[PDB]
Amino acid sequence: YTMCSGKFSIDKEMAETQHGTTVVKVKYEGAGAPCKVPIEIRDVNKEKVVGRIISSTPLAENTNSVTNIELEPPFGDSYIVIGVGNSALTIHWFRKG
Amino acid sequence: YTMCSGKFSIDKEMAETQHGTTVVKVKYEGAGAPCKVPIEIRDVNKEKVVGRIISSTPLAENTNSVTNIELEPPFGDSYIVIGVGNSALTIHWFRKG
């Protein structure tokens, strides 16, 4: 699979789980599915944080499909960008230490 | 910057340099520039190979702009995917050991 080229929207706001992760649900509104949900997690220095995605490589299976994404945000501020281009969405998360 | 959402084409075929790298030039034909050229390098097991991009984070500055990309392919077979979606291009490279 290649990365989805189209727009995503938040289907369920990012929320903390009980086992030290967060989960967010996104709806894929674009074309070219099945395709990989583009997900990048960066710290305050805009540097990528690796290995924090818990879900097996999240896919948008079809146009309008909803995908569950489980993440393990680092401590402090992280900026999670889902999608590509001008329609990419950013989620700011703060994890208290 | 976010990742470019649009189509790229090969402007200059991937070629070996003298100092143990390769260089390929791509033309960005899409919108939303300036944006980051999406580049992933995977091995035969389709696993990402990290730290092989020599160029500072390649950008497409504008629609129709041409970007120079210097890479350090791993030994053996690597598959370099530029772009996203159904218009993403794949380059197969073999590096003799």
Side-chain angles (χ1 to χ4, degrees):
Chain A
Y1 301 120
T2 54
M3 281 181 173
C4 303
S5 61
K7 179 186 173 174
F8 288 83
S9 56
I10 294 182
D11 178 78
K12 186 174 175 167
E13 299 299 332
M14 182 173 289
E16 200 169 357
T17 73
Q18 289 309 320
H19 39 283
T21 58
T22 63
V23 165
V24 58
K25 305 191 186 184
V26 296
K27 175 181 189 211
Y28 185 52
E29 300 170 357
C35 48
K36 298 183 294 186
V37 182
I39 312 165
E40 295 190 352
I41 306 169
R42 295 178 185 272
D43 55 26
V44 188
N45 301 317
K46 297 187 181 179
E47 286 190 46
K48 287 187 304 233
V49 187
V50 68
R52 308 306 289 205
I53 299 175
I54 297 305
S55 311
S56 59
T57 302
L59 301 179
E61 286 293 343
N62 289 286
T63 300
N64 301 326
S65 67
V66 176
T67 301
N68 193 65
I69 301 166
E70 186 169 9
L71 309 171
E72 202 176 1
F75 288 95
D77 302 280
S78 62
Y79 297 85
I80 303 106
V81 178
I82 295 173
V84 301
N86 281 352
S87 60
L89 64 95
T90 302
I91 302 171
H92 168 243
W93 188 264
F94 174 74
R95 181 184 179 180
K96 185 181 184 178
Chain B
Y1 301 120
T2 54
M3 281 181 173
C4 303
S5 61
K7 179 186 173 174
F8 288 83
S9 56
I10 294 182
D11 178 78
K12 186 174 175 167
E13 299 299 332
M14 182 173 289
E16 200 169 357
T17 73
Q18 289 309 320
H19 39 283
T21 58
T22 63
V23 165
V24 58
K25 305 191 186 184
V26 296
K27 175 181 189 211
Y28 185 52
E29 300 170 357
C35 48
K36 298 183 294 186
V37 182
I39 312 165
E40 295 190 352
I41 306 169
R42 295 178 185 272
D43 55 26
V44 188
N45 301 317
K46 297 187 181 179
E47 286 190 46
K48 287 187 304 233
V49 187
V50 68
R52 308 306 289 205
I53 299 175
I54 297 305
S55 311
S56 59
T57 302
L59 301 179
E61 286 293 343
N62 289 286
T63 300
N64 301 326
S65 67
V66 176
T67 301
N68 193 65
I69 301 166
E70 186 169 9
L71 309 171
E72 202 176 1
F75 288 95
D77 302 280
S78 62
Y79 297 85
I80 303 106
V81 178
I82 295 173
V84 301
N86 281 352
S87 60
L89 64 95
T90 302
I91 302 171
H92 168 243
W93 188 264
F94 174 74
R95 181 184 179 180
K96 185 181 184 178

